[PDB]
Amino acid sequence: MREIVHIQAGQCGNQIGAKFWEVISDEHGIDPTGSYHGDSDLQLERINVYYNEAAGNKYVPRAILVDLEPGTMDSVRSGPFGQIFRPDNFVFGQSGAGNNWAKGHYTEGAELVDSVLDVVRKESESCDCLQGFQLTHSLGGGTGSGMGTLLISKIREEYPDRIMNTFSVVPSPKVSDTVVEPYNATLSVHQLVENTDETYCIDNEALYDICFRTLKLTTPTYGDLNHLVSATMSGVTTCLRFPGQLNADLRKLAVNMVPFPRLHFFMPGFAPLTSRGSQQYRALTVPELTQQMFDAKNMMAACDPRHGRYLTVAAVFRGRMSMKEVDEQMLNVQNKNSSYFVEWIPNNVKTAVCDIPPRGLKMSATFIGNSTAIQELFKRISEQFTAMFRRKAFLHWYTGEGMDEMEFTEAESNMNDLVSEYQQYQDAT
Amino acid sequence: MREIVHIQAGQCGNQIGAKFWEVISDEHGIDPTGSYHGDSDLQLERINVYYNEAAGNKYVPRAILVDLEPGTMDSVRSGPFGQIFRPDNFVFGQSGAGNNWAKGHYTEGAELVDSVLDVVRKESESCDCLQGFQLTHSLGGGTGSGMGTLLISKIREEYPDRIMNTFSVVPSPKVSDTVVEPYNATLSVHQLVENTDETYCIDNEALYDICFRTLKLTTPTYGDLNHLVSATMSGVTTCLRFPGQLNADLRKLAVNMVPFPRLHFFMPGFAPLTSRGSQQYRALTVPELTQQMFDAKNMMAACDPRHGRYLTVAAVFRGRMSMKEVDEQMLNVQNKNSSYFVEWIPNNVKTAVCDIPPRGLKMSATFIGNSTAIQELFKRISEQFTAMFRRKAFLHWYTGEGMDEMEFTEAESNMNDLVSEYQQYQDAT
Amino acid sequence: MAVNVYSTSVTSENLSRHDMLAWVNDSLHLNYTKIEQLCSGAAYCQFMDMLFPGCVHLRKVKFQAKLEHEYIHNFKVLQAAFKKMGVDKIIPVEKLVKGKFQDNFEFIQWFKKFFDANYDGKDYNPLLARQ
Amino acid sequence: MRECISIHVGQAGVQIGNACWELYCLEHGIQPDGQMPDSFNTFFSETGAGKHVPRAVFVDLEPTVIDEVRTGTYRQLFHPEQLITGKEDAANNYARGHYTIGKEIIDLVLDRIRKLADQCTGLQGFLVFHSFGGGTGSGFTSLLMERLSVDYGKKSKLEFSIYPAPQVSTAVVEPYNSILTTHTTLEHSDCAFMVDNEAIYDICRRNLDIERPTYTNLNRLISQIVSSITASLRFDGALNVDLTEFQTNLVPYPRIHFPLATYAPVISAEKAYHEQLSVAEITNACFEPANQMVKCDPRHGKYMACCLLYRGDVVPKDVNAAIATIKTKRSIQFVDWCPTGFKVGINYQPPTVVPGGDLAKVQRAVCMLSNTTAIAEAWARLDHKFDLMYAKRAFVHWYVGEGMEEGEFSEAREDMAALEKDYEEVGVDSVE
Amino acid sequence: MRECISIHVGQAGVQIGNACWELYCLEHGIQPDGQMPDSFNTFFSETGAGKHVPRAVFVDLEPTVIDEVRTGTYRQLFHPEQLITGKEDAANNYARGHYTIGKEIIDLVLDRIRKLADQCTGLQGFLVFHSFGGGTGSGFTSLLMERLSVDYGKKSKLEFSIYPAPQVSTAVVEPYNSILTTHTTLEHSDCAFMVDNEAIYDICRRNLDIERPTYTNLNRLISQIVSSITASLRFDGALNVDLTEFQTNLVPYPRIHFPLATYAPVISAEKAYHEQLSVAEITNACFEPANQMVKCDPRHGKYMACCLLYRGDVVPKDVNAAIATIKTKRSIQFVDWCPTGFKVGINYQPPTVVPGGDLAKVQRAVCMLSNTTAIAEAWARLDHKFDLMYAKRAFVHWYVGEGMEEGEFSEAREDMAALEKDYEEVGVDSVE
Ligand SMILES: Nc1nc2c(ncn2[C@@H]2O[C@H](COP(=O)(O)OP(=O)(O)OP(=O)(O)O)[C@@H](O)[C@H]2O)c(=O)[nH]1
Ligand SMILES: Nc1nc2c(ncn2[C@@H]2O[C@H](COP(=O)(O)OP(=O)(O)OP(=O)(O)O)[C@@H](O)[C@H]2O)c(=O)[nH]1
Ligand SMILES: Nc1nc2c(ncn2[C@@H]2O[C@H](COP(=O)(O)OP(=O)(O)OP(O)(O)=S)[C@@H](O)[C@H]2O)c(=O)[nH]1
Ligand SMILES: Nc1nc2c(ncn2[C@@H]2O[C@H](COP(=O)(O)OP(=O)(O)OP(O)(O)=S)[C@@H](O)[C@H]2O)c(=O)[nH]1
Ligand SMILES: [Mg+2]
């Protein structure tokens, strides 16, 4: 009953993915071997959403791990929880893509993709009623971006009526992690616009800010960053996995959040977030949570929501709380912040409530904003792309793999059109 | 009540045969001395199918071991289980055939054949109701191929109303094990087409692939390969030896699988097949088994079933399982893979179920496919034969033993006709 | 005597998948839709005939090959043609015959360069060569 | 799995190789006899029981330098067939290296490479160590590269080069050798990492307080840089970079494939105790011109790519912070066609320190690979040097005597002229 | 049961025999006195109590070489009647070997063979060791073969031959001897395994690092090859090959019965420690022309049959894999009439190593027997040599003086011409 198929591509994709898996196992009372050691029957009721039941009281993640290099896979295998994964679901190459989108999409990735697809099909067939797919990856590298997009394209072709959702780690504005990342992102976005139903934009710049400023982590590590992402991810599927009072799911959320097909790029957020010492000096009531949710400093995408307008917002609450109170809070935010919400979508806040809170907390909240400010990010990428492409810098690395300028051009154009569309709705009255 | 007489020819024939015997003894609770040390009365009920009861609570395989060289026989005798065999049932020459079909069929083999026949007749007379004969051998050498075919011919003449089944190890496509193997195979096939009721085509190329890719055996050995073959073999007779819910036997299987007399060459398969570590991460339900059975990578013949159509498929299941489920699975495979099944044989899947599973497993499955793709193999052999015969290469080795070109020619023609026949049914609507 | 060339890393000296396949289809009058279809070796054998008539035993080529060994056979003919003409480039047969895109695309990149170095513009009807 | 084949050509290449393989052994816990009481495997193949053998070839045209290896401490480390020597050297003559003497052993060298490569399941590529100035380092290396390009195709090839200094030469004919080898190797190399002996000496004197640094010291320093480059492949890391990634991120146009290496921190133990070495602190050290290993001025050039490879106790956020501040800095200008100039690698393993070495043990290190229009200056200098001698045909008769043709000199020079112009063109900012 | 009778003719045959029987004794644990403190039995008959005697005949026309055996370490190993000597040698004259001197001992030799054969229950056949060049090796061997053909009929006969080198001769009349003996033996031999002293010397120098290899070394090497051929009969194996199988799988036409032997690996202990010797690795070694034991170029010929005999720690799948990759390789071309070119044998017993030998102890070995159109070159050379001397009738008077007729020379030559043409015809590919 509503199986989700999980896919992880590249280093980023696999590191976030592992963390996510760890989070989920703890929630469902699953230990590193796949055995259930939980307390309550509710933990097992909907375990089939993420786990296949194997022989002898074991549960195995419906997870496929993909990379053109093996080192990350090895690391995962050696990690805490590494042994829970099905060995045949690790599909790795030997070559790599050399941070090149073309290599991931057309060359090395192409050589590996069939093997992935075979696994995926089997996984799909395992499920009684497949909800769809969640892909974790970056847009800036070669495998996650090129191979990942290719995978998406094929999956969509095979299963056009199932939901495709992605958790994409997007390039940062202040500093680049690779030199060709604008190319890789731009290409990837071209695929994503046509082939995903929803995309959560996660940015490391935002994450670091959150960790340093809000969480008071002097020197946050990638693991810590991943944890936040995992928390968000778990939040989005909580209403599918536990009984609630007003229950959401992936389809409903998409419907509420996506008024036009191309505009499916979300700014995710999570609340609450406090230091170790600072948590004793404040109570986690719903209004506090709401307040934490609605501000620029708590968004995981490096763009200010105050630079645009919200088309829609979905808020997913976990824990025992008063529905009336929640509704009041939702009303209040809309009324007081009227100028940040588009005027032609009345009641553009959607609420979901799941009775099961996450571990350690009595209540939490997950925020999904569809904000016209995300256009800024796209614009930056377009600018960076242009600056390089006009001088044909690095181009021979991609053309050498069989790619043509036309493909690049078209991709750029598509990106530009999306930006224009975003602008149009931002400006409409 | 339904005695089977087992015959082993040459090195291959004897190595596979020994393994088979080992498998069978374990199943029926027989130790290396012939004494029953099993648990259940069901293990002894139908022990007479493969064993003669000797004086003093001992059971002896109804097995005849034949070779033109003694070394293999000696090895068998010295092996674990070597002492279980009747000493007078080892019939070996001193000369060999020098990898020459002619020597096996007309010369050295001829000198030994009468002695074999004498034993065989006695064995037949031992039995209350002889079902027939199973011969294990290769087609590529001299003894298994030439002597074996001769033996078959004589046996058929003597006992024309009994079933003759063969487990033939067929030459590989990528590499040849001997230079004259096309001649030896072609000649052998000429005899087999006219004198066997069913022939299981087993190919070492396929076997290695299975062992390396599916079983995750880095460096598989011939013993391991033989084990797989033995498992298949045991599977085919399981319904004759144990009570079941829908019981098959050798005759029934032949009837279901052979719509035209010459088309009796099967592609055998076995399921399940897993690594040592990988078995804990999956449950052996019937659908899984079915899925494992129906694919190209799990066939023990080096030909892709997707290059032809299935005329018929027999599936034999062992273990406690639901008949309904089995039937559903059978229906499902037919419906979804419609294009791979000939349209003029409705319901071309036959099912048998035996309640006794093999040791170590709760359920297993054995697959017998009559696929028009096997024609590829025959074509290859014909091509190889032609290439050599047109230049009369190596011919003096055979003509020197009294053989004429006419015999070769006729054999070639017969093979070609079979191929044509296969093609005709493949193409028919 | 036939001249020989090398390919590593150069700009404005490449060909897109589409363009390369167009070239192969126009040159040999066939209808490939994937560059990986060149893995059968028949096309390469034909190209050798067109470049250096008599360097290849085309009567031995299997133009309707479907199986790995058939493809291997074509590449043996190609190998022999290369040896006869003194082209020193090692053909990665095992990788090519698996029909992998990367290996085939790199090989055709080199082959195109080799062809351009050596082709004198003569016209021939490849249909007769084929059958 | 991801094997890396190392080739050490001529005296410089061999001697640096000695330093590199010594370091690798210490890093993987391999003794000088090949024994150890899984990460090693990219650099060492394994045989029988309790022995590990470098994936390396050492070649020189004379026996003396390699004979030291044969008779020395690591005699048991290498298999005899991977230590290749001729009889007579190339006598600082590219011609002898490329043609007369080199054509006698090239087949042998390549045959052994083929044998090495046959035992690789996932060959990443080749690391070639040599100099620009020697007859073997110039002529033989060029030859070798040509053959490798033919026999292996698009497999990644990397070069570590002792580029000639502005005012510190050994030979008189260095400019000739440098120019010809650059010309001949250009279309065959994917990326070449220049290093300059003068600069390293300065570093040794200034940063390590060494009055009289020896070639050994330089070699040791080089070994550190090489280790940083391959540590991402030999160890687990937070964010990883492989040999194929460099040429993508550091080479914007095919001919402009000369990034420069800078390592930090290079300090003595006595000096290390009074300093806390943060990521910001070492990054700043790197991005200051005095710590560079080529005697050139980046302040007078523009950056086209920077790749920063951190190792040890390093935290991604910290690195990001460090880089951000360096971006602001006046002394760091980037070309106008390149808004993203940084590629960043972070590996968990701290730099290993050779017993009896000049460097102190640190919790963090960083190796920057940067590509700068300032390198054009060096090329200009070299061309000028060539011009001065060639105008008089000084030493030309030697080259011709070894089978070179005079026209090839002019050819090499014109190609280098073109190269110089290419850099210049790249330098200028975009119209509109 | 499956007995094998060995005949050692002349100096080469006897000396190689010394090396072979020394090896067999070590392999079966038989002491030099015939004692041991069941596999032996194909090569050794057993007598009374605690003594084992070679199924062998040693023959030479002079006493000196056999006298060494009689007085030597293995004096007690052989029965006196199996060591046969005349008084005067054949003086490098085929005529003396075949007629004048040979006709005096042929009856004796055959009588002893008959006695040996009478104690065999399952005679597989004969292994005959000799050379092409000596008067005994050429003339006597031919005589012997003729008689054996008559008295035993279709029993398999195999030859191991020291074929003459291209540019390394002992005698001047070698070509005459070679040609006549090949002519006379051709219709009587089923398969003959050529080996060349030059090639073995090269192997010794190149692969074993021996400055000055002696005939002993060569003999030892030969003994290995012979052991590989008969190990399948003397030991248990996974997949087996017997003496009757070779002639079926290696001889496509009656006259084309000259396969060539190649053994791998041939290494010293010092070199073996840095190498892991896989099936693929040794197979590749074998299939490279430098490791061949006849100085000929297979790259310039085509293979008609290859038989690969593996021994020791060898796994069938691995062998299959190895062969498959070699099939792809450009340097391996097969004749068009032969889509299946490989016969493969695998035996469990690792190669035994003679104490004080030049070869290191390995887990695996392989012996290839291959038949190649490249052998035609050797024949052409030999014919040319014959022609040059015969045109002047150089040395002819000797042969005539010993009862040969001049017409027989021309006869031999024409037969060899025909043989040469037969190879040529076989070479070309099939029409349509
Ligand atoms: N860093 C460093 N540079 C070296 C070393 N040895 C030589 N060099 C430099 O290399 C150049 C001389 O080239 P060599 O490698 O000695 O010459 P070669 O390659 O042996 O060539 P020939 O002797 O001419 O055959 C000069 O610029 C030297 O300063 C060394 O151990 N370390
Ligand atoms: N490999 C090897 N070759 C040998 C040996 N002794 C001789 N030869 C070769 O055998 C040929 C000479 O023939 P021999 O066997 O000495 O002569 P013979 O058979 O005794 O004949 P006559 O003395 O003429 O009666 C030359 O090609 C020698 O190189 C040996 O111990 N080993
Ligand atoms: N939050 C988070 N971001 C990461 C992680 N790993 C990498 N990134 C970010 O993702 C980008 C590169 O991701 P990466 O994983 O290298 O893509 P890739 O395609 O797998 O890289 P490749 O195989 O082509 S070399 C960088 O911007 C980096 O900052 C991680 O574990 N967590
Ligand atoms: N699966 C399997 N195949 C084998 C075995 N032994 C041999 N073969 C295969 O069978 C073929 C040769 O079989 P072999 O047993 O030599 O026939 P034979 O007739 O007995 O051989 P001979 O007496 O004429 S020399 C080869 O292709 C080989 O790969 C075995 O134990 N298992
Ligand atoms: Mg030198």
Ligand SMILES: [Mg+2]
């Ligand atoms: Mg003599």
